[PDB]
Swiss-Prot record:
Function in brief: Catalyzes the synthesis of indole-3-acetic acid (IAA)-amino acid conjugates, providing a mechanism for the plant to cope with the presence of excess auxin. Strongly reactive with Glu, Gln, Trp, Asp, Ala, Leu, Phe, Gly, Tyr, Met, Ile and Val. Little or no product formation with His, Ser, Thr, Arg, Lys, or Cys. Also active on pyruvic and butyric acid analogs of IAA, PAA and the synthetic auxin naphthaleneacetic acid (NAA). The two chlorinated synthetic auxin herbicides 2,4-D and 3,6-dichloro-o-anisic acid (dicamba) cannot be used as substrates.
Top-level taxonomic group: Eukaryota
Name of encoding gene: GH3.5
Any one GO BP annotation for this protein: positive regulation of camalexin biosynthetic process
GO terms of molecular function: indole-3-acetic acid amido synthetase activity
Family, similarity comment: Belongs to the IAA-amido conjugating enzyme family.
Gene induction: By auxin.
Pfam name, any one: GH3_C
Name of this chain's protein: Indole-3-acetic acid-amido synthetase GH3.5
Enzyme kind, highest EC tier: ligase
Keyword Ligase: yes
Amino acid sequence: DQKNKQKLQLIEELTSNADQVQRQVLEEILTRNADVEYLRRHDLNGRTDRETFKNIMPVITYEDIEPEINRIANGDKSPILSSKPISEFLTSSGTSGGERKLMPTIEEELDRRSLLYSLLMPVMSQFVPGLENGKGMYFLFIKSESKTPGGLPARPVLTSYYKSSHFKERPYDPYTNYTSPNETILCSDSYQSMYSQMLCGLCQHQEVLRVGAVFASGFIRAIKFLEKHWIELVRDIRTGTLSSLITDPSVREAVAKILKPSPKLADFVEFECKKSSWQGIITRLWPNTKYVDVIVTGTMSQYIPTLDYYSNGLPLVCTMYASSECYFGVNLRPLCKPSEVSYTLIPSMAYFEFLPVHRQQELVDLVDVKLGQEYELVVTTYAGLCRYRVGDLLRVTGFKNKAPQFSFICRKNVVLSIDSDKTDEVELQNAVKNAVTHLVPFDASLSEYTSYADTSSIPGHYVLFWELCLDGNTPIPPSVFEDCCLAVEESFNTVYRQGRVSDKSIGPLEIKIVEPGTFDKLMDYAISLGASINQYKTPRCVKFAPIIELLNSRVVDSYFSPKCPKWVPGHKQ
Ligand SMILES: Nc1ncnc2c1ncn2[C@@H]1O[C@H](COP(=O)(O)O)[C@@H](O)[C@H]1O
Ligand SMILES: O=C(O)Cc1c[nH]c2ccccc12
């Protein structure tokens, strides 16, 4: 019987009693945090009931509780948001004033993250058999850490999770037996982390029954890493000796238990990697792979054709929906189509509310959301976030017993995204305005521009299309356009700049100069589909393949900066 059946029954119990669980969660939070400064400031006066909470407590954004956050981050240890000690800040990919948002968490929250993860394979065991008889090849990575002036860790939620006893000291689980040893995941050197993970995956290739990464982008980068380094990898496999470039002793102690001299495997890997076409290479190097486990909902959907290419059309699986401030839900139907993914929110994670979005107690509870209606996700967490707006838009597609299921629509205001980076229109506009100052000495200027997330390169990069207006009589040298590139990048927020400098999840920004009349063609094309002259601006971003092919066909010159933007871990202040 055991675990799977119990976990599946737990899902039944939680979703059949969703409203009661939601109530018990809110009651527990307000009872614990009854005396914290934030609740007392709003005069909640020790009350714990739903009606009081919804009538009294305001619906907030990050900027609303930043003074509380800063105070805690500066070392104020009084109960301001939470009665249990804030153990760390989980730095979100979402920003504020260019800097990562600091999400308070408490130690207890790891239990709830682990509960969520423990649901995944029992759910999957209903759709794909035999996964306990083999391994999963996942490429998992830690990121830069930082510390608040008061001494609290500030780091991404997965970096926090991987380094915790819940992952680093976890027991052997046959349904989640990874090819990557903990030492290779927890390696601070990102090159060594990637190389050793790729090697271990190759060494255990016949046992691999599934592959992936947290994000589509992450898995694509691992494939590209093999494209560049397979010769070194084949040499390691052939001789049974790990590359001396791997200097980390914990790494390589771990590899040494896995790596054995095997010219037969080396010949096999060489054979496949030598081939000019890498179409379907996943199903050749790892022939027992049943699916690809990566997020391809949200902006990550742009990577579907790339994964399909390398996998020869294996099923793409989206298992979960979660964030820094709170873990949310699970896909109860993982082998569905990527366009039909819905996430069932787990009612014991947090108190969930929903702000209706239309094309006086305003909020609607989890069980009262309406089929087909769009909402903004609003959360009340154990660490003291009260009715915080996530910025995620969701649509109800159905119900699991009493618990609703949501397709993910978007994170609000995201224009450009390659990996976890999110660039909005204001950021983009500001960035382009800082870069055009470089065209002033040449008495040139920008007439019009647009952008796209270029996925043809690994890692992806931002592309800007620039149509200039030249009034002077001196050509602009490549060095100045390269200055323009860098200037754009320097104006982007810290997550973008971290992706460029530290995580290598983003390639150099490219500016493509297009010939005169190019954006005229765009408009003409934009009217043949969708034809509103009155309401027409050249869009800040484009995404439709024929439009992009049109713009690329009219490129006169392109430029990247050889330089990287500034980046320093932690908040500016
Ligand atoms: N499965 C998913 N599909 C689409 N977007 C997601 C998914 N999981 C997380 N996200 C987005 O990433 C955010 C979490 O980012 P972070 O706070 O940095 O972990 C969420 O609030 C969503 O906007
Ligand atoms: O930065 C990280 O690695 C944590 C993270 C960022 N976006 C996420 C979405 C799903 C679960 C974890 C994360």
